[PDB]
Amino acid sequence: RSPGVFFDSDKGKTHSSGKVLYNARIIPYRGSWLDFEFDPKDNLFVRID
Amino acid sequence: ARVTVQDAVEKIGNRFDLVLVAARRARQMQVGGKDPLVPEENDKTTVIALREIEEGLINNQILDVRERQEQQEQEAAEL
Amino acid sequence: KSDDVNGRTKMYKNIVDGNHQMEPGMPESFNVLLKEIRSLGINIELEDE
Amino acid sequence: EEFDAIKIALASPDMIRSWSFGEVKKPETINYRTFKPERDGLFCARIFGPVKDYECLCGKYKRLKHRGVICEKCGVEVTQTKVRRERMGHIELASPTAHIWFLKSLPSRIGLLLDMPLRDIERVLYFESYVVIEGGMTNLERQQILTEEQYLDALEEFGDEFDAKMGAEAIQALLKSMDLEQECEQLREELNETNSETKRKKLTKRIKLLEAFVQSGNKPEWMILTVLPVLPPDLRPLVPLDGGRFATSDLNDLYRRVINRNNRLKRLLDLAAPDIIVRNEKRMLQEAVDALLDNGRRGRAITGSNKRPLKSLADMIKGKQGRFRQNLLGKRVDYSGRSVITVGPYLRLHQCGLPKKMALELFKPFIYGKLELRGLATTIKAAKKMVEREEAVVWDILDEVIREHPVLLNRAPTLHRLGIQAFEPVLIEGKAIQLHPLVCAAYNADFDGDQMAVHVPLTLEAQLEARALMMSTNNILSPANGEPIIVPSQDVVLGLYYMTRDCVNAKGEGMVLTGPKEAERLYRSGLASLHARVKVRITEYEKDANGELVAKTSLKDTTVGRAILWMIVPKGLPYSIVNQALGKKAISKMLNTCYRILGLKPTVIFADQIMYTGFAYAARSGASVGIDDMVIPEKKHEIISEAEAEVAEIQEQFQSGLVTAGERYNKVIDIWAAANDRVSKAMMDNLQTETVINRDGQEEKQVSFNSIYMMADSGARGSAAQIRQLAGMRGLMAKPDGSIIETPITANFREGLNVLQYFISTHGARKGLADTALKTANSGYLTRRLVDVAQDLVVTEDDCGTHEGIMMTPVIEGGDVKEPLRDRVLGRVTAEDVLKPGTADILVPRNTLLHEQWCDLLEENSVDAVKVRSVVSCDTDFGVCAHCYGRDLARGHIINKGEAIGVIAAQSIGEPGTQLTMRTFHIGGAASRAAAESSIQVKNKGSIKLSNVKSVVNSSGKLVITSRNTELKLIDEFGRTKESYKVPYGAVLAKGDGEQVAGGETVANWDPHTMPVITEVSGFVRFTDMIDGQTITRQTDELTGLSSLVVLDSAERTAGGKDLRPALKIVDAQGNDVLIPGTDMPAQYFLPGKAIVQLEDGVQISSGDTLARIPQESGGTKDITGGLPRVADLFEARRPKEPAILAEISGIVSFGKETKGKRRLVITPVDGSDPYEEMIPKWRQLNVFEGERVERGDVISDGPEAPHDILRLRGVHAVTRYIVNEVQDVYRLQGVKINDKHIEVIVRQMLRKATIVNAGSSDFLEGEQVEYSRVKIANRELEANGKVGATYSRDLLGITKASLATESFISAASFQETTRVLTEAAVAGKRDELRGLKENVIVGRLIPAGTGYAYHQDRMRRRAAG
Amino acid sequence: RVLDATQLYLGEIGYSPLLTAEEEVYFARRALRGDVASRRRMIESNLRLVVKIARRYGNRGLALLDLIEEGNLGLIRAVEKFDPERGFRFSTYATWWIRQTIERAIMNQTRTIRLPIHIVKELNVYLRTARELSHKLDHEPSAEEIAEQLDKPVDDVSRMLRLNERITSVDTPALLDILADEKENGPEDTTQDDDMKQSIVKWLFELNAKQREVLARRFGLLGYEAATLEDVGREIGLTRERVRQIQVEGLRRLREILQTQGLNIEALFL
DNA sequence: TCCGCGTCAGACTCGTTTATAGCATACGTGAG
DNA sequence: CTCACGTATGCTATAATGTGCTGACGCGG
């Protein structure tokens, strides 16, 4: 997977609610990964590494 | 027989018991050196026992009866 | 044919002697299994007749 | 040694000391210079034993003379080195250490025992926080955690009179102090006063734990380790590689960790170290022991040298790779070999070509033996050297040994029992094994490099079991279904087809022959074609009423070829068998017929003869494959341009507005699917006949002798589906998702693909190939779950004498009877004195075998329904009766007592799945599905019978159905059911109930794409709760502006609309609610996910109208990929996500309470005064209306039925029949024939356990789960003697749980979850008496089944005395 | 959610007091006199020094915690043999002790086959020499090249580098299943010995009773202790020359068995 | 959020990186 | 009976005293 940004989405999977949760993943060539993701309640979250 | 063992199954019935009885008889000829009732015709002890079962000479009950007879003859000799 | 150590040699001798008799025993893999479960601190005993 | 059972229990510190022969104090392994064991090290000879046989370490005592002589100087016993594999040691731990298995393994025993959460215990163990063990002052009670600062507070104030500690010492003290008796009584007192539903379970579970703990005689303190056992050296060996280097087990690294840290802890205690450092060392000690027992459970596993985690004790037992699956439930074997396989067409069915050099090696001891009896070899080493030299006399001896000695051939994978067969070997020059063609089917052997294992049965018993049970000749029929597995294919089929099939005139039309011999002589003389029409005189031999054969001579109008085949045909059979043009389908019937009339040896000979003649004439024929043999229809391009402008017009209509992605996808797929069939049928008319041959004068039509057509029609190889892709159109290809590509491949392989068509093909191809690699695993995992569940099931009894059975109807689905009742009850014991229609005389007895003859009588009388004895309803405890089962389908007669039925059942269900995975996938590219299930057209005249149907008459005049379950049947005159037809919801019927229709009439039309929501009442349409953006969505058009509404489900829906159900509500002109005829229900139709409504609010509807179109995208492809999960869901007894509701008790019902919309359906039975009240969702709509007298298990809701609810209300035969039919639906869709009785075996194993209410004279009380057989045994003695009667209720267990619920822990452990199984067994002090097969195979004993059943039953009676 | 043994311990150490110069002297005088609290406080306060040393020689063999514990053992010896009378600081003296005990433990525990410090120290010199050789010789040190530089024996250098050869796990990929039990004979070989042992009994009752007696008692076939020349002679009362006479006669009897059944003995020539 | 599963044999090859002070007395067994 | 040989426990004094891989399988209970 090329370093850069990638915007992906669990197509359902989590929560039989069946909500599409969108996420951004910033992938460097070297370093910690920077994740942004949505929660079922539409709250924006960050996962460092 | 030589090819197929269907006839010998038809004599005794249970395939499993056919195998036990043919085994017991083959062991007699293997160890005791018991003489075969049918001509050997260069046949292995496995096949000869099946011939004897097919023709209806060998059987669990018959083998038990002759075991008692030889065993009582030996008791007679010891006493 | 596999583990039984005494059994395999004894039956080899019988087959050269032309006895075609098995004389079975206890598979060494199982002896190991016992030792491996006792090494875990579980008492696993053989209960006699 | 010979033992009865095995028990497992917690190890006492002192028990561990018993096994030990010393304490290993030091980590020292061996001396670097003298590579001998160090002092009191891990390989200490003083502890584990001597390195060399009967020799001490310092070397003072040697030879077998010195026996048990412990050398005074070094301290080493003079015994065999073998002892170092058996002697154990131990380790004195400074700090008590918790045993991970009882701590971490869920649920956990230490936590459940103390009623203390895991978190609390861990804080205590890693020395984060103190726990109170006991305070007389209620100030601080029991098990209350104190932090470092919390401990300082109470310590000044109270102190002393309150005891709180940290680490495993604390928990061990807490375990020692806890009284199992008293807490049992306290917990019983709690359940008496206030039993809350969910916590009654948990309290009853801790009660069972406490009771079981005291009965086992296990002590809770022992969960914490004071003494740590050490595995014998040879089981963790340090050996020298050739390179001078050493190689050792990872257990040595883990033991050295534990010893170093333990000894360092002893040191720091001797030195009085400050407590922070002592604590660190106690943490590190527990870390090391937990790594040694089970590494990776306690968090991050300890990585050794590479980075890979060290393999710990538990890892050697647990995994598939552990010791169970790898070394115990299967092993590497002596007198075993392998090689590539190759054909032996010359062989007879009971023979196989075995390479000289291979056989020389396998029968080495047998040669040695004969060599010494002839006195040719003086001793064994001279015999060995004679074999090494491969002397000429040795070959002659080897030939003599192999005579009449059977050898086992095995091919991977072994899916079913015919994957092993015995043959008589034929010594051959060359390195390849020669396999008989006809058995290639059972092995699934094709000679493009496959290999086979060879195994030599050594004992007389093993030889006999191979010759009698496992011989090729004796295993002709599949044990799965009754049919012969030994069936001609490929060349053989093609040759017999070529011989039988007829041509116009040809050489010597209308000649006359004296018997088949004149015919053979004519053909071989070159005066007659095999296809010449002629009248020969053949003399058939028909069996009479007795055993005597009747001879009959008559003139027959057939062909030269068929006459010559009659020569192969044994006496007894009719000439009409060979008189047709023979294909593989007809030849299979031929061999089955011959087997049931004449018997085994004749069919064996006949089979070989067929193979020889089939190859022989196949080769004479010289049939081959030219490119001109692949004929393209002249009218392909027309069909395609028509289809192509049509699909183009729908794509242009897509931008306009009549089309969703799903609708157009369906419409384009339908157009291309019909075009493909058209072009294929054009090719097959043009190819199948289109033979213009001039008959003796003028022109005629007859069948084409085109090579590929003959191959297809005979069933020699390719099917019409393959030849479509060759000569016709390749068709619509399906993506790896299963969804089908919108652009089909117009071209075929003769025409050649272009770059784009080829690239598009690749998708389907590779998904197929990936499917074989990846999906095979789940098929195989299902085989293994089935096998484990039905291992114990053995034929135990001959006749239980039961009347009970499961009513089996004829599977008549989809017009043409899918599976006849005759074939479904063939070979099955009948019951309930099943006579003929006119009840005034018995026709069939209550205990007999249904032979082909009885079955043929059944068909003349046209019996529809027959109660037959089944495995499920058999009363036999600990097995099943020969009569309840019926015929051994593999033998063709009544099953033998002692046969392992369960295994055969599991194998036979498992095999097709596993075979159809690789098989359909590599072999096909595209998906040739047909979705056009619009109209029911009836094939034969009759009257419409509609069972289960509630429909409303629409303004058209037409009967529009609004039932969910609708079954249209076709009755004749006499009044039998002959065709069925599942009518759907939203259907227009042409004619109503009980009306006459003629042959080829359409009786009902419906749209397949879109299940419409059809309203019963007429009036105006109201939008309830249908807020835009909240619940629905709005989409507008141009010029005027047509809006369309799509119902967004909770998936896309906002938090605001979550609680709102959107529904189209029917109001009248006044704007009052219209009622549904005759009920209090107001009309309201709840719209699901993406219900696309056109017509906006306030539109006058008539009744019977389409309100809403829910899109029904069927992206499913017809394969086992989608099918097998359905099968696995059924066998695992899974409740679906929306179960349909059933009435629990018979009786008369009215409605009570409602929560907004949620129905609280109140049943108030007639006799049974207690009511039964149910909460029901608002949107779930009922089939039943109000006051009806409904019985147990009447369907209330729309939805699939849970097998649990079926069993619990209707009962055994109901649920068994539900499973059998729902599973068989899948396998039948793939053309797989499995007998119901196999599925029935496994369902019996599912219904093994039962929950009990009340007490008897034993220890039942409320809700213990015990096996059904054992509670029946109790009930039999109870009913005779009396005592407290016990109500029971059978429980369904789905496969995995059913296998773990078996009261053998050796079977449970070998299956799965071994760590959890052994902790629960160890704590219960469980005793396994070894009744099952897996148990006996593990200890290497005789199986309690087949041969072993005789011996095993003799041991069980030796238990009664001596 | 602090679960890790390491992070818990380092949290506990951080919670300690840091000592000064005057404080070190006061506590050290009380400590040598044998104060409980003084010893505990000096150790607890100087744990941080052990860690900065245990985290310095990381990724060398032993784990941090393992080295943190053995290093702590050096701290204790340091507090026991500290001289507060000397003006020179404690941290300086302790560093020696902590490094010594850690290094000693790393030389012993690390190696599965316990390697003696004598050989380990020699090995150190060989390896340091190899490093200097490698920097100037672009290639790597030979055994002979190292031996030339240290003026030591080639054989001694080779023995040492052989001991450097580290251990191959059998379970790490399994190697166990390839590598056979060399001490266990195949049933083929065991059956051959049965045939020989059985033949000997029959061979003993085929020749003379005077010679068979000698060979049976001497070889320990029917006997127990393999009596040498003098013991066999003393028993039968025979003489040393008589031993050679019975031996030569016994071999002639075997030659007869060989020309009869020698078909097996002549095959011993390959 | 955790932990339990995920076909069965066969062929071959490769492979077992690293750092450490130096010296004097003490502890203990073996050889001549 | 005595020394050499192999192995082990000992001590050293500028001050220095707080850490630290790979991520993402999927279905069920």
Ligand SMILES: Nc1nc2c(ncn2[C@H]2CC[C@@H](COP(=O)(O)OP(=O)(O)OP(=O)(O)O)O2)c(=O)[nH]1
């Ligand atoms: N378990 C298992 N069996 C396999 C696998 N590949 C092949 N087999 C077995 C079962 C099918 C058999 C032959 O495989 P083929 O691909 O030749 O298929 P086939 O069924 O003979 O079809 P075809 O007529 O195309 O040759 O070998 C595999 O990956 N796993």
Ligand SMILES: [Mg+2]
């Ligand atoms: Mg193939």
Ligand SMILES: [Mg+2]
């Ligand atoms: Mg193949």
Ligand SMILES: [Zn+2]
């Ligand atoms: Zn000794």
